[PDB]
Every structure is written in C-alpha cells, then in structure tokens.
C-alpha cells in the first residue's frame, strides 16, 4: 500500500531532474519504476499519483515536456500524464 513516504523518496532523487538540471538520473529511474510497479491496482495507483502531483506541484515552472520525458527516458512509460491539472482517479484500468 502505497502511503507517501515512499514516493517523497524517489522524488528526492527525480527533483533534480524534474527541476530541469541533468537526468533523468539513475537512482531516480530505480525509484519510479518502483511507485508504478508497487501500484498495479487503482487504489495504490491513486495514492501514489495523490501524492506526486501534489510533489510536482511545488516545482518552480514545471515542465510537462520534462516530466513525460522522465519516464520516457528511464524506460518506464505511464498510461497517463503528470501534472498539476491531472486527475489519475479519472484513469481507466
């Protein structure tokens, strides 16, 4: 069950990157991949994503393009998009 203090861990590393500096880096890669395969259902899939695009959304002008581009670029794409005008719970299966 995917809570919160797991996704702010992989945020950490992926801030860096999210931030428009150099990655996506690797220990960020690992991470991400991680809150998406520890949410195969909806419901976990609704925490995590309740708690990353609150995360994204102290990010100082956020890049939609760099944010696709994370998991593009680690191999690891999502059936949806990050954003502070996202709504994962409207995401079917």
Known sequence: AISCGAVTSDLSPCLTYLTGGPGPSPQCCGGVKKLLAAANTTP???????????????????????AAALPGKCGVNIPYKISTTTNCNTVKF
């Not at 995360?55 to 100082?60: D, K, V, Y």
């Open 44 to 66: 976990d899939r609704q925490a995590a994503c309740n708690c990353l695009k609150s995360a994204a959304g102290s990010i100082t002008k956020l890049n939609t393009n760099n």
